[PDB]
Ligand binder design. Structure first.
Ligand SMILES: NC(=O)[C@H]1CCC(=O)N([C@@H]2CCCc3ccccc32)C1
Ligand SMILES: [Zn+2]
Length: 139
């Protein structure tokens, strides 16, 4: 589980969004596993605006933050699961690291701020849904 709180927005994995998120929906994209909903209070996270390929992510299944190298956002095949059939997920970045389904929502950050959240995993890999192209999150 996990979310990014920037301004009056809440960014979560779309497969983990709640009633309030859908009711106060701002934007969603199934092909990116992302959902943004409006909030009453202001958040304090800063979104990174950069091309960094190194950062640190939180792994809840290990209670540990791991430094990682990650690929650029891409269209990657994601095997079928209980939340989606087999499909290509867009704006996805992979790293070699531990990831379990309950790890989705864990933040990936660089020196510039939040890069994205855990979305995929298994086979000794971990995938992150990029949020750095979502410029409207800053306004
Ligand atoms: N974005 C998606 O299509 C995800 C939906 C929920 C979900 O569990 N996953 C995968 C399943 C395989 C193991 C695994 C480990 C860690 C994180 C995520 C997953 C894919
Ligand atoms: Zn950066």
């Amino acid at each position: 589980s996990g979310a990014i709180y920037v301004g009056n927005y809440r960014v979560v994995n779309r497969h983990l969004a709640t009633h309030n998120d859908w009711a106060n929906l701002v934007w969603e994209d199934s092909s990116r596993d992302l959902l943004v909903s409006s909030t009453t209070a202001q958040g304090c996270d800063t979104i990174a605006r950069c091309d960094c390929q190194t950062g640190v992510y939180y792994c809840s299944s290990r209670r540990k933050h791991y430094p990682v190298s990650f690929s650029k956002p891409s269209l990657i095949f994601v095997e079928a699961s209980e939340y989606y059939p087999a499909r290509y997920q867009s704006h996805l970045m992979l790293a070699v690291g531990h990831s379990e389904p309950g790890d989705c929502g864990g933040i990936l950050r660089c020196q510039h701020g939040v890069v994205g959240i855990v979305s995929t995993g298994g086979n000794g890999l971990v995938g992150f849904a990029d949020v750095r192209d979502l410029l409207w999150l800053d306004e």
